[PDB]
Each structure stands twice: as C-alpha cells, then as structure tokens.
Design a protein around this ligand. Sequence first.
Ligand SMILES: CCOc1cc2nn(CC(=O)N3CCN(C)CC3)cc2cc1NC(=O)c1cccc(C(F)(F)F)n1
Length: 280
Amino acid sequence: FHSFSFYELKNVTNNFDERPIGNKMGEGGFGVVYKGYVNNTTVAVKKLAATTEELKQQFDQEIKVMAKCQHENLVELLGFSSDGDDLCLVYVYMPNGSLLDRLSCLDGTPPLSWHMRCKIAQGAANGINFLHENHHIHRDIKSANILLDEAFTAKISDFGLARVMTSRIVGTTAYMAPEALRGEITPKSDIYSFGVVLLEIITGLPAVDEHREPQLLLDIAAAIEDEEKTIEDYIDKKMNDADSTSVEAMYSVASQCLHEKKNKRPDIKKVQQLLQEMTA
Ligand SMILES: CCOc1cc2nn(CC(=O)N3CCN(C)CC3)cc2cc1NC(=O)c1cccc(C(F)(F)F)n1
C-alpha cells in the first residue's frame, strides 16, 4: 500500500481509455474500472465519479477498512490517488472479472461449471463471514461486487458503503433486503443480498432483467415457494455437471437467506456450514 500520482494512473490506463477489450473493464454508480500496469504487476484502477462530498467519504471509508486488510476472499487495495482532479483506487487485478460477467459469459468466456459455482459460493460466504466477525456490514453484496482471480477464487469488492437507521438509503435495489430499502443498517441485510447472489448462481439470470417476466429474480423464488414452479425449471441450462440434490441444497440456503423477516434469516456462520454440508 502506497500513494500513486494521478498522472501515473492516467499514463498506465492510456489516458483512461473508455474503449473496452482499450482499457475499460467495467463500471458502476461510483465510477469506471480500468486495466493498468504499475510497478511490475497488472492492476485495476477505479476512477471515482458520480455528491462530490459523499464520493470522497466512500473513498476515505474504502481506504480506512482495506488499507491494511488481507484475506483470501476480499480484494487487495494496493493504494490510491487524490493529488489529481479525480479520486482513484488501485487494486490487484482479477483476471476473470465479476461473477455477474462470468454468469453472463461476457466476451465469449465459457459457462462456469456447477463445481466452480459451489466453490465461488463458499468463497464469497467466507468473505462475508470475515467482515461480520470484524463487525463490518458490506451494504452492497451482489454478483458484480464478487470478483474472480487467476484460480476463480471469490473476492468481495466495494467497501465505500461498508459500516441503527439511516437517512440516505444506498445500495443496489435488485439485491437489497426490505429493511435495507427502509434505511435499516444490519448485517442480516448482507445475508439477504447473498441469497439473491445464490439465485443468480443457480439460474445464471441477473437479479433484474427489465425485458424478463418476472423482472426481479426474487419473484422466481416467491413463485417456487408458492408451489407454482420448482427450482428444477430455472437451473442454468449452460451447465452439464449440475445435480438436482446439491442445487436444492444451495436453493434451501438461498430461501432461508431471502426470509422477509430479518431475525428468521441464518447468520453468515450458519450459511457457511450449510454450504460446506452441500459439498462435504
Ligand atoms: C469491477 C469489475 O471490473 C473488472 C472486470 C474485469 N474483466 N476482466 C476480464 C476481461 O476483461 N475479459 C477479457 C477476455 N478474457 C477472455 C477474460 C474476460 C478482468 C476484470 C477485472 C475487473 N476488476 C478488478 O480487477 C478489480 C479488482 C479489485 C477491485 C476492483 C474494483 F472494482 F472494486 F475497483 N476491481
């Protein structure tokens, strides 16, 4: 971890080339992620962009929680830049991008095997466990914020909103718990959001598709629980190694996570155990 010059980060991203394939790898609400090469390693450079004050607060927060953090299932922050006109965060490069992009087979990548999906589910849950052990709430758990390294190891990203009620309601609505949408801040909200990620993994479908019926993946769960559908009907067809048994084990974990009453949901510790029993 050390301070980078804005102009060094500009240089290694070809002046922040927004063309893909180009240096642009992804983007979100809080900025664009660029491929760079600094020191003697390939790096991800997140140039932050929209409130200018809230943006700087999310920047300082990310640094405060991740500056010294090292974990198997969390991204590694290598440094930052605030000396230029734009705020930049620099991470270790995740060559296999986001769980979302790999579930979508973006840029012609092969579909993730059920085996790969199970290990990624366990990894992410191990990442969320470490945060809850250290009394951190993520507040933005989703397939886009689960990155995959050279070995498809799950790495949780985005700690800008990482932390009771609140005034400014923040997060990705497709993944947010009912109480999180009301402004409640609790680690039980992360468990819910993880439940939506498990539905994405089982189905290969994004949490929200405006051109889909139903539009929210949450409804598919609701439809299955009301005996109209079975999970069997929504299992990702782009797999050859998926067994109904272990699929239903993961769906059972997803269902418990997606309980509308926060207190009925399992803790992250119970989620890990149920996901281990799934494979063991
Ligand atoms: C945030 C998603 O951004 C990325 C997308 C990526 N895609 N590809 C692969 C890729 O482009 N292709 C080309 C064709 N081959 C076949 C394979 C797929 C690697 C990616 C790495 C990405 N990000 C990071 O490394 C990263 C790491 C830590 C923190 C962050 C943060 F966002 F928080 F800032 N980002």
